Ligand binder design. Sequence first.
Ligand SMILES: Nc1nc2c(ncn2[C@@H]2O[C@H](COP(=O)(O)OP(=O)(O)O)[C@@H](O)[C@H]2O)c(=O)[nH]1
Ligand SMILES: *Sc1cccc2ccccc12
Ligand SMILES: [Mg+2]
Length: 166
Amino acid sequence: MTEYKLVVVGAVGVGKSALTIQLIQNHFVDEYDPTIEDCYRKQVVIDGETCLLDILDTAGQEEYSAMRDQYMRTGEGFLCVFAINNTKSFEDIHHYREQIKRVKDSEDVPMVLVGNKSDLPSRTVDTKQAQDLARSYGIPFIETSAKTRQGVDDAFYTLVREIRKH
Ligand SMILES: Nc1nc2c(ncn2[C@@H]2O[C@H](COP(=O)(O)OP(=O)(O)O)[C@@H](O)[C@H]2O)c(=O)[nH]1
Ligand SMILES: *Sc1cccc2ccccc12
Ligand SMILES: [Mg+2]
């Protein structure tokens, strides 16, 4: 059956691991080693079509490695994650976006922009400015909380739809 290869990228601490573990294991893990990169696989059903998701939860020290480049070439879609209380992580999106397009040598790569930690009160990044950036990229924007589950399945499933459309 169909497999979708997803790569979760973004600055350290934005919640890549928390998002991935919430999606797969349905619980919020609050102090997951920042240095661990790993693959999470799970069978799921999406719009009826039964699926295998292969999700790469990236670690920052691997950024310029030959292995990262191969993983990006293999990856079919990218969840580009920032935190809504961390402006720098939002500004880093530009960097990850350009890297993915370069490494995969394409201007149209399946992607979703994710603004995580939506449960936190101290917002520094407006939804509108994230929506504006996503529009400029021509990709969906989904706001999530790995802690509460809000938006998590939508983020990942929407990325699968983006891969289908491609
Ligand atoms: N309140 C809240 N905390 C979060 C959320 N996602 C991650 N965190 C916390 O933010 C920190 C970094 O999360 P982590 O998943 O390790 O980030 P990574 O470096 O992108 O893998 C951890 O302390 C998590 O508990 C969220 O949606 N809400
Ligand atoms: S989850 C996983 C494991 C190995 C290689 C991958 C490439 C791209 C996406 C996900 C991967
Ligand atoms: Mg992590």
